[PDB]
Curated annotation (Swiss-Prot):
Component of the thioredoxin-thioredoxin reductase system. Participates in various redox reactions through the reversible oxidation of its active center dithiol to a disulfide and catalyzes dithiol-disulfide exchange reactions. Keywords: Disulfide bond, Electron transport, Redox-active center, Transport. Induction: Expressed in both aerobic and anaerobic conditions. Pfam families: Thioredoxin. Residues 1-103 form the Thioredoxin domain. GO terms for molecular function: protein-disulfide reductase activity. The lineage of its organism: Bacteria, Bacillati, Bacillota, Bacilli, Bacillales. This is Thioredoxin. It comes from Staphylococcus aureus. InterPro entries: Thioredoxin (IPR005746), Thioredoxin-like_sf (IPR036249), Thioredoxin_CS (IPR017937), Thioredoxin_domain (IPR013766).
Length: 103
C-alpha cells in the first residue's frame, strides 16, 4: 500500500504525477497515530495519487532539502515539485481535501 522511499531513489519516485510524502520516524508518537489514516487514504486514491513514507532518521538529507523540522510533516508533490504542506496529526477528511485540491 504505502511505498518506502529514501535519499537514494527520492528524485526517481517523486517526479511525475501527484505524491503525498510522509516524513516520520520510529520515535514519533503522533506519526504512529497517522499511519493507519494514510493506509486508508492510500486506498481511496489508488491510481490517482501515490503515498510514500520517508524515515527522517535514515534519510536526513531529503528531510533537510525540504525544510522538514518537526514531524509528522506531509508534503504534496506534483510533477516533482512540493506544492502543499501539512503539519501534525490530521483526520482522513482534511488530507483528502488537500489531495483533491491538486488532482
Amino acid at each position: 500500500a504505502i511505498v518506502k522511499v529514501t535519499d537514494a531513489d527520492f528524485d526517481s519516485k517523486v517526479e511525475s504525477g501527484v505524491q503525498l510524502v510522509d516524513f516520520w520516524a520510529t520515535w514519533c508518537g503522533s506519526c504512529k497515530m497517522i499511519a493507519p489514516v494514510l493506509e486508508e487514504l492510500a486506498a481511496d486514491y489508488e491510481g490517482k495519487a501515490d503515498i510514500l513514507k520517508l524515515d527522517v532518521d535514515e534519510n536526513p538529507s531529503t528531510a533537510a532539502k525540504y525544510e522538514v523540522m518537526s514531524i509528522p510533516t506531509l508534503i504534496v508533490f506534483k510533477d516533482g515539485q512540493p506544492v502543499d504542506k501539512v503539519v501534525g496529526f490530521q483526520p482522513k477528511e482534511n488530507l483528502a481535501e488537500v489531495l483533491d485540491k491538486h488532482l
